[PDB]
Short mmCIF file of C-alpha atoms and ligand atoms in Angstrom, two decimals:
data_model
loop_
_atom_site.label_atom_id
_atom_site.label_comp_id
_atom_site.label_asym_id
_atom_site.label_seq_id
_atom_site.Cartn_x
_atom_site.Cartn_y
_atom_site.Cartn_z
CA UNK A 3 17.71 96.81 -58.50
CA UNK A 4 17.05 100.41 -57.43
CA UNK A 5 15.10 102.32 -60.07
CA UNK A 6 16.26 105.95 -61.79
CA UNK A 7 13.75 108.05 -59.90
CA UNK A 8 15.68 107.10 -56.57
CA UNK A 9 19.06 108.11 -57.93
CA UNK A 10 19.93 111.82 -57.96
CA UNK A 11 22.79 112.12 -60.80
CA UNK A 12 26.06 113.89 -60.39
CA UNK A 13 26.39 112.63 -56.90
CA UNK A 14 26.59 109.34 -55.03
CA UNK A 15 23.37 109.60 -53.43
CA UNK A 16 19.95 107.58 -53.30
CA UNK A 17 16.78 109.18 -51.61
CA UNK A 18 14.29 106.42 -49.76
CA UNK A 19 16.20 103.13 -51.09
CA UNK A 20 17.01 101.06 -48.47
CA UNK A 21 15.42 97.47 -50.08
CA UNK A 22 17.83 96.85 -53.12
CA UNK A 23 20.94 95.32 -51.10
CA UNK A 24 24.07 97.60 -51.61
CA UNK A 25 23.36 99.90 -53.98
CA UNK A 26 26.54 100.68 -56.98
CA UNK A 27 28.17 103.89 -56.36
CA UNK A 28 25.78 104.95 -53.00
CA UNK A 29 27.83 106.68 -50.51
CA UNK A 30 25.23 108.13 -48.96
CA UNK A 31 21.29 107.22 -48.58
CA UNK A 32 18.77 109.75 -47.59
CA UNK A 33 15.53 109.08 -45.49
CA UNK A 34 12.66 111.86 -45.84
CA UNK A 35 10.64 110.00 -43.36
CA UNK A 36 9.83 107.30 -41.32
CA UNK A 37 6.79 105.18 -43.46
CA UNK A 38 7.39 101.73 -44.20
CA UNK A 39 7.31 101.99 -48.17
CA UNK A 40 10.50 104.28 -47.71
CA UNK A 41 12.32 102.94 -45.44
CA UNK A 42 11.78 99.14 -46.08
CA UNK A 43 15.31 97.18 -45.94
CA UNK A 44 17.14 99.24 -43.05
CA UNK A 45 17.75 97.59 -39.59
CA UNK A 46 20.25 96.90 -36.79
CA UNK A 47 23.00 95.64 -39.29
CA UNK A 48 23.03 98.53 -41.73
CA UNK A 49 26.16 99.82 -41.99
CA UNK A 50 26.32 102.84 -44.77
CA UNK A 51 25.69 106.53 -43.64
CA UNK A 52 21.74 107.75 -43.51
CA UNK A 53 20.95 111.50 -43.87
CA UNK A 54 17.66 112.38 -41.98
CA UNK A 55 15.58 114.80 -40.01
CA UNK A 56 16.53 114.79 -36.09
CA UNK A 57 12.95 112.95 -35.83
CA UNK A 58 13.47 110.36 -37.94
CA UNK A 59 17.26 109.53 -36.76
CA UNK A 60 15.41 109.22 -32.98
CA UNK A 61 12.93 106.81 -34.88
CA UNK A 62 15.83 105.19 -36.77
CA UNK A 63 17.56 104.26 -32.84
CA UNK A 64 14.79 103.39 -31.48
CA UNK A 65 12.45 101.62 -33.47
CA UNK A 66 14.58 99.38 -35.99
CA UNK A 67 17.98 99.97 -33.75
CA UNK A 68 20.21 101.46 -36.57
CA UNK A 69 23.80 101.70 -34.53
CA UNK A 70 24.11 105.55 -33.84
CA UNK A 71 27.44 105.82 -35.52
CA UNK A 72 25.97 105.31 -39.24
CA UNK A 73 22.79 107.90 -38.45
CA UNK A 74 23.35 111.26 -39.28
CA UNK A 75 20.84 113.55 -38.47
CA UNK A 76 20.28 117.11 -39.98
CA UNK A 77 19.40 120.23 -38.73
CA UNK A 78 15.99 121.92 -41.14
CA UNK A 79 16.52 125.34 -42.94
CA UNK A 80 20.35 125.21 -42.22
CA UNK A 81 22.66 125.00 -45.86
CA UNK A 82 25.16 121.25 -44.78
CA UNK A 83 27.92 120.13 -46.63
CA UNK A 84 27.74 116.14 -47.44
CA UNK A 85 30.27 113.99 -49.14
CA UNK A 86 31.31 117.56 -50.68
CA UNK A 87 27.60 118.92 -52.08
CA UNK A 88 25.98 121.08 -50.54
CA UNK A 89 22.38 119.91 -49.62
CA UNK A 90 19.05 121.32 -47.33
CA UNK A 91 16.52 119.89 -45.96
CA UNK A 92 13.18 121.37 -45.65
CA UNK A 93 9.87 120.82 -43.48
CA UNK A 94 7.15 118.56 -45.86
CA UNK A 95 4.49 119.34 -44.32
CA UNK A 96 3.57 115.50 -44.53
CA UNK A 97 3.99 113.34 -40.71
CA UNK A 98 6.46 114.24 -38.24
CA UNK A 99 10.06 114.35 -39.15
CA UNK A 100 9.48 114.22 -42.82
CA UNK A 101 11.75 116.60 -44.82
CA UNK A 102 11.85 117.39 -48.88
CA UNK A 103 15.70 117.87 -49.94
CA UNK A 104 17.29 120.61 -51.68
CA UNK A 105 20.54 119.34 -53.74
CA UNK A 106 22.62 121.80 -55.08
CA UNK A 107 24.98 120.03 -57.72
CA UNK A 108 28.68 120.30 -58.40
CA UNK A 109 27.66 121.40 -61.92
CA UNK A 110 25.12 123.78 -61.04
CA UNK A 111 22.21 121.90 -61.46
CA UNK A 112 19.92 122.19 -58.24
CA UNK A 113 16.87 119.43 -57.73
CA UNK A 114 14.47 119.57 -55.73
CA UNK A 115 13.25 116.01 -54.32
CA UNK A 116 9.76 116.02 -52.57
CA UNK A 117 9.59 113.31 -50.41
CA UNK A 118 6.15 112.60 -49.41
CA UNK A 119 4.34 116.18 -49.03
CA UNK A 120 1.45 118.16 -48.88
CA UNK A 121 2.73 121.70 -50.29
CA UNK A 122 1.23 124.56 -48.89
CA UNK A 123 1.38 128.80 -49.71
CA UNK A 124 3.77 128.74 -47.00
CA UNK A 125 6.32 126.63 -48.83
CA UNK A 126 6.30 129.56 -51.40
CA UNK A 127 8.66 131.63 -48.49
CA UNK A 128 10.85 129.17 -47.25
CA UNK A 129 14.58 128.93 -49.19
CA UNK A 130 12.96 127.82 -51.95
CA UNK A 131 12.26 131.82 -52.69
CA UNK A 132 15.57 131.98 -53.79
CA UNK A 133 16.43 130.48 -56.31
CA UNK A 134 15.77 128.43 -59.60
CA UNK A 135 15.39 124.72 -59.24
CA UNK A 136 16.21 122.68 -62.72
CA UNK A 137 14.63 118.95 -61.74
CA UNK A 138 11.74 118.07 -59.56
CA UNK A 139 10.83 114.71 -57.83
CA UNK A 140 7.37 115.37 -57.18
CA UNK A 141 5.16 113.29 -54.59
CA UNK A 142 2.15 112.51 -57.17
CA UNK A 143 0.13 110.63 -54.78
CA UNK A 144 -3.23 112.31 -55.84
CA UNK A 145 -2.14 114.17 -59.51
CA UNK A 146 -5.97 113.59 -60.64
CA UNK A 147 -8.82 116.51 -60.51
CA UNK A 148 -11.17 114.15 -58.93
CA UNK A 149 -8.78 114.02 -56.21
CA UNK A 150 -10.61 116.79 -53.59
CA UNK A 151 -10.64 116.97 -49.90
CA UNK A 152 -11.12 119.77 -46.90
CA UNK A 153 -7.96 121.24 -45.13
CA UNK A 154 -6.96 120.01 -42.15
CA UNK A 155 -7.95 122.63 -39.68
CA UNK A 156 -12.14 121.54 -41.30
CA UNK A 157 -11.27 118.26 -40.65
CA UNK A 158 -9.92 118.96 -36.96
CA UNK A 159 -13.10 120.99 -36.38
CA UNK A 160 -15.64 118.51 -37.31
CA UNK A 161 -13.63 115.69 -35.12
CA UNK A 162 -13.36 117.85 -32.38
CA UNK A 163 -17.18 119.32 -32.19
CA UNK A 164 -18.26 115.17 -33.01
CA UNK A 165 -16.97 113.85 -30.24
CA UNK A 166 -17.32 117.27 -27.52
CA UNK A 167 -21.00 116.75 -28.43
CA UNK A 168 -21.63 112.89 -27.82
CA UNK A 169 -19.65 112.81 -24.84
CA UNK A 170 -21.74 115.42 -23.46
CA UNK A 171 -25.20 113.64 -24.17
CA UNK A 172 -23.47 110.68 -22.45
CA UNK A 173 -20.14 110.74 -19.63
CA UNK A 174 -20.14 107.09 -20.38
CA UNK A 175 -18.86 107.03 -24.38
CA UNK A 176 -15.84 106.21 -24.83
CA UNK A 177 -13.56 107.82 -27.99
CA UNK A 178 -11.47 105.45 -29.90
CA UNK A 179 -8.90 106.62 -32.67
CA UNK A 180 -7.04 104.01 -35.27
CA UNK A 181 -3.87 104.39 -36.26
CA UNK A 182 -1.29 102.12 -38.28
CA UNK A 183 2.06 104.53 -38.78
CA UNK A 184 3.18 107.80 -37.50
CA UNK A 185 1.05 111.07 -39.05
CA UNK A 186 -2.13 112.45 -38.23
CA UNK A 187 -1.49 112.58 -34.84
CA UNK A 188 -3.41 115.85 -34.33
CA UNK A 189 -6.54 114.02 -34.79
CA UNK A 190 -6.63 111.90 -31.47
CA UNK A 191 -4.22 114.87 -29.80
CA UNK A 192 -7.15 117.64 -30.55
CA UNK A 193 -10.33 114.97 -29.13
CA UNK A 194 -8.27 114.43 -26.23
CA UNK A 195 -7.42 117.95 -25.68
CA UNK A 196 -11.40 119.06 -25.89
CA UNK A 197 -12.50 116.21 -23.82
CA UNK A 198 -9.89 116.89 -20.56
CA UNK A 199 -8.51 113.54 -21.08
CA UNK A 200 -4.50 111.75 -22.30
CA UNK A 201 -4.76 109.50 -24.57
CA UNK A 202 -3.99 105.76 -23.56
CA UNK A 203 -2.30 103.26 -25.74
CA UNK A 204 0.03 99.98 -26.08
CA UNK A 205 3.35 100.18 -25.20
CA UNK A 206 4.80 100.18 -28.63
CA UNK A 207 2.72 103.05 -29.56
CA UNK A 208 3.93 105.22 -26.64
CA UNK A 209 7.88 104.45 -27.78
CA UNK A 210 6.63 105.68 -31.73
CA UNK A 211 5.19 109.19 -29.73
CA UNK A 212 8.22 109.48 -27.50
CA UNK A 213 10.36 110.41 -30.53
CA UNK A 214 8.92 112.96 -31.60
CA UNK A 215 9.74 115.90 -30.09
CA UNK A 216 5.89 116.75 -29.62
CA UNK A 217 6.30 120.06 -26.85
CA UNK A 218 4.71 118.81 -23.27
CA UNK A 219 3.90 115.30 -24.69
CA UNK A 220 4.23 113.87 -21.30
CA UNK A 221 0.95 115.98 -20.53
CA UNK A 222 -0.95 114.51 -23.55
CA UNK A 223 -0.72 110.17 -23.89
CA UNK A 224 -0.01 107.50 -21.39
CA UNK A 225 0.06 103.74 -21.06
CA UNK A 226 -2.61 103.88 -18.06
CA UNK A 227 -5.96 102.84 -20.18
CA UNK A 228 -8.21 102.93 -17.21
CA UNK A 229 -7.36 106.73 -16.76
CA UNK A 230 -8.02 107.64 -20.46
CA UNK A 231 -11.46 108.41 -22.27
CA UNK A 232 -9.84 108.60 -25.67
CA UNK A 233 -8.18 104.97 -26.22
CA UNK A 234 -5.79 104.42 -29.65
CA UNK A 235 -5.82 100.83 -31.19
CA UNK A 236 -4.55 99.76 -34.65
CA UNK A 237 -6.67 100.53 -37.26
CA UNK A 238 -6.88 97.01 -38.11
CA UNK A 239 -9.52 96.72 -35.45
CA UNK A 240 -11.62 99.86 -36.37
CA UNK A 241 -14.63 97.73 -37.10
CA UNK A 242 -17.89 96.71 -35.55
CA UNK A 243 -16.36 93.31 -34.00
CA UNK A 244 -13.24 94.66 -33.03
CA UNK A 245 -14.59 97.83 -31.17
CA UNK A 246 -16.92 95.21 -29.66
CA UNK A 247 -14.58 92.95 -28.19
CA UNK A 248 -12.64 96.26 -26.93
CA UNK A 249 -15.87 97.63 -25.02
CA UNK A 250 -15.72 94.08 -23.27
CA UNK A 251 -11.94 94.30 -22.02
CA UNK A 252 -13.23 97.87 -20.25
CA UNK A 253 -15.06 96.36 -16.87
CA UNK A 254 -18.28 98.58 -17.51
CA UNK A 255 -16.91 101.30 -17.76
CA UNK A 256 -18.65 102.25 -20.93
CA UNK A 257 -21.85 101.96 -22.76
CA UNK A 258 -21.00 103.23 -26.27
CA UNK A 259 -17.64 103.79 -28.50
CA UNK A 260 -17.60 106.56 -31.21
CA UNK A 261 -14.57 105.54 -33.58
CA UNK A 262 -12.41 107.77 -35.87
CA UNK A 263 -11.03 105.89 -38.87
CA UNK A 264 -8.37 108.55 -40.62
CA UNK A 265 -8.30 107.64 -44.05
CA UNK A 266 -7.05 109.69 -47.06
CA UNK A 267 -8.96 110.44 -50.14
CA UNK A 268 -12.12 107.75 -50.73
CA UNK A 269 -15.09 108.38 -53.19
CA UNK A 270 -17.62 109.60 -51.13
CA UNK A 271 -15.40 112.58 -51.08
CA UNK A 272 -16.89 113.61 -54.99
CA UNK A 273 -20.34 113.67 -53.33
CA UNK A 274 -20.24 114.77 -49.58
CA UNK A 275 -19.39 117.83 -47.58
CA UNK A 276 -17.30 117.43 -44.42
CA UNK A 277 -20.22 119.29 -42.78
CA UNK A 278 -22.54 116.16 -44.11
CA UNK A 279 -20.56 113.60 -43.07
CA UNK A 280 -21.99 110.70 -41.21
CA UNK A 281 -21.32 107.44 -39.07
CA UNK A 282 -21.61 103.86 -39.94
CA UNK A 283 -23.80 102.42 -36.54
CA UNK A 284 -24.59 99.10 -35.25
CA UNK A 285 -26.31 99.35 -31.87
CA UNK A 286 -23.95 101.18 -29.02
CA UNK A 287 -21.51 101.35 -31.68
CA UNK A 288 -20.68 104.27 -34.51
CA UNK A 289 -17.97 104.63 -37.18
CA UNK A 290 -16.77 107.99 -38.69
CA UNK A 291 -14.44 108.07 -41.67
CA UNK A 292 -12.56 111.10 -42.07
CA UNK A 293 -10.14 112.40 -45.13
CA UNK A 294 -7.67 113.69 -43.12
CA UNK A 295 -4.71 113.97 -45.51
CA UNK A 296 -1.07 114.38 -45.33
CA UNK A 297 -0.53 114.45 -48.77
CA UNK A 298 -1.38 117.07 -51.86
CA UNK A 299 -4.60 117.55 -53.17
CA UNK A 300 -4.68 117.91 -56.86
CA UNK A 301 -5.37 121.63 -56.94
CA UNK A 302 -2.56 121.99 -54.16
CA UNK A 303 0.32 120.13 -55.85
CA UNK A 304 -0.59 122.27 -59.06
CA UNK A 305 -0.08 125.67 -57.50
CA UNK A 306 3.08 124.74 -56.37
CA UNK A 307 4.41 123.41 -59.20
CA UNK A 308 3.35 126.39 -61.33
CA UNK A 309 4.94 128.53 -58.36
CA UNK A 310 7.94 126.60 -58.96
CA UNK A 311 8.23 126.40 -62.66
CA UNK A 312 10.47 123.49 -62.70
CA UNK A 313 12.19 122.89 -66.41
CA UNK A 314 12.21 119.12 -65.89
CA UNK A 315 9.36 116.89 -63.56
CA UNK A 316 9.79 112.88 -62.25
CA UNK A 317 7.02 111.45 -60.50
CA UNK A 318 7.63 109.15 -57.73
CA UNK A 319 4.32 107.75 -57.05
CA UNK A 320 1.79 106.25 -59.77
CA UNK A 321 4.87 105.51 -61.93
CA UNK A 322 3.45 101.38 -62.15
CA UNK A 323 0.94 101.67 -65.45
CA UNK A 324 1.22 103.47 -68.59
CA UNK A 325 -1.96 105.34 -68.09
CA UNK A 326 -1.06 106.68 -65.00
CA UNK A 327 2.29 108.02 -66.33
CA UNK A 328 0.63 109.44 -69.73
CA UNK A 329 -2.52 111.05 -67.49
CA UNK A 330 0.63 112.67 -65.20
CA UNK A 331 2.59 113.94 -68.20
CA UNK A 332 -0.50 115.13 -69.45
CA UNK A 333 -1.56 117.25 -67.07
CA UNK A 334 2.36 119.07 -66.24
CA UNK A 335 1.98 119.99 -69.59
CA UNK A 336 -1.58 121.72 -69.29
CA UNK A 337 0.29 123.07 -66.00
CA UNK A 338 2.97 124.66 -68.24
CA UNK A 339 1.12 125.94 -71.30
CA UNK A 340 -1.27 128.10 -68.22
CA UNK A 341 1.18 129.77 -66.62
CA UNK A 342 3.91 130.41 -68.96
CA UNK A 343 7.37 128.47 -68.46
NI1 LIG B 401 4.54 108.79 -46.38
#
């Protein structure tokens, strides 16, 4: 049975439930993004209308083979008319194709439903300038103070300069980069980029890329391993016997991996500068984890929110325990009494 926080009242729509069979009153289900805790439940025999990002409808085709007549793709910034509301979706900021929805209700209500984000100062003059927004879903993946990590561009910077150098001390290391979903795709794209090489991986992995609309892609990643010095694998096998047994498969080519392993937030985090960050090693082999994050940190979802000065907030993530929801509601009331609304 799907749960309230999916449901946006006044209309007939559901946002990122797709696993509770045929849903009472749905006539339309929306899809921020393409991560399998969203869209779990569609395939090939779906048969209701989706509302999506252009990205994610290429996905949608592609991937799990939704028939192109029930996909219906949305152009960003652009005010559409659905089922008789008018609706919007806007760039998240999270991987590609994900979108956060405007809804702007029948009885003048207007929500604003998240998705999976990580809201930046650049959000703050996008059509959200405009107007008032009465309900918000709110991604509350990290809505804790202990929840810190670097921007991006840091993060990029230190992967980048890591890998230029060691490559440099030896033409024979090889670069490998795990990855499990789409996202995060800058950090093997930015390695690759510094070291003159594409990036080779499977088959299936190629396909994923393809949809993306990444400009001059067909420049960047190919299925040709042999011609690659940054290889992708699934980040399953980002460990010391499955980089191993990779190094074997590449005919002496190479004498040493150095291994990215995006994660998001961990502990070590309350402790350790990016700039002090170091490998895990076992012989020819080293390990880097790096908190490369596509969703808010605590101090970022709090601007925003106190930007926004919502009159109503519904967490969709962390909503399991009763301490999680009474440490949330806690702190969008400290949020409140600060700035005001
Ligand atoms: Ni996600």
């Amino acid at each position: 049975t799907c749960p309230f926080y999916k449901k946006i009242p006044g209309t007939g729509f559901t946002v990122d439930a797709f696993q509770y069979g045929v849903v009472e009153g749905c006539t339309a289900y929306f899809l921020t993004h393409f991560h399998s805790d969203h869209y779990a439940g569609l395939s090939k025999h779906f048969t209701f209308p989706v509302y999506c990002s252009e990205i994610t409808g290429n996905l949608l085709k592609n991937k799990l083979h939704v028939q192109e007549q029930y996909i219906h793709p949305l152009p960003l910034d652009t005010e559409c008319i659905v089922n008789g509301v008018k609706v919007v979706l806007l760039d998240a900021n999270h991987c590609p194709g994900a979108v956060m929805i405007l809804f702007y209700l029948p009885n003048g209500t207007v929500i604003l439903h998240t998705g999976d984000f990580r809201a930046d100062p650049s959000m703050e003059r996008s059509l959200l300038a405009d107007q008032k927004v009465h309900m918000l879903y709110l991604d509350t993946t990290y809505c804790s103070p202990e929840y810190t990590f670097p921007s991006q561009q840091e993060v990029i910077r230190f992967a980048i300069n890591t890998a230029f150098e060691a490559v440099t001390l030896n033409p024979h290391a090889l670069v490998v980069c795990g990855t499990y979903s789409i996202g995060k795709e800058k950090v093997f794209l930015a390695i690759a980029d510094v070291l003159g090489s594409k990036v080779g991986m499977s088959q299936e992995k190629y396909k994923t890329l393809q949809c993306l609309n990444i400009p001059e892609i067909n420049s960047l990643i190919t299925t040709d391993m042999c011609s690659s010095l940054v290889h992708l694998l699934p980040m399953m096998q980002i460990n010391f016997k499955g980089l191993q047994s990779h190094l074997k498969k590449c005919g002496g080519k190479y004498n040493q991996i150095l291994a990215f392993r995006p994660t998001g937030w961990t502990h070590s985090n309350k402790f350790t500068r990016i700039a002090d960050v170091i490998p895990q090693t076992k012989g020819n082999i080293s390990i880097y984890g790096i908190p490369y994050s596509e969703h808010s940190s605590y101090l970022e979802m709090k601007r925003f929110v106190q930007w926004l000065k919502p009159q109503k907030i519904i967490p969709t993530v962390n909503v399991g325990t009763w301490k999680s929801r009474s440490t949330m509601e806690k702190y969008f009331r400290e949020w409140k009494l600060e700035a005001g609304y």
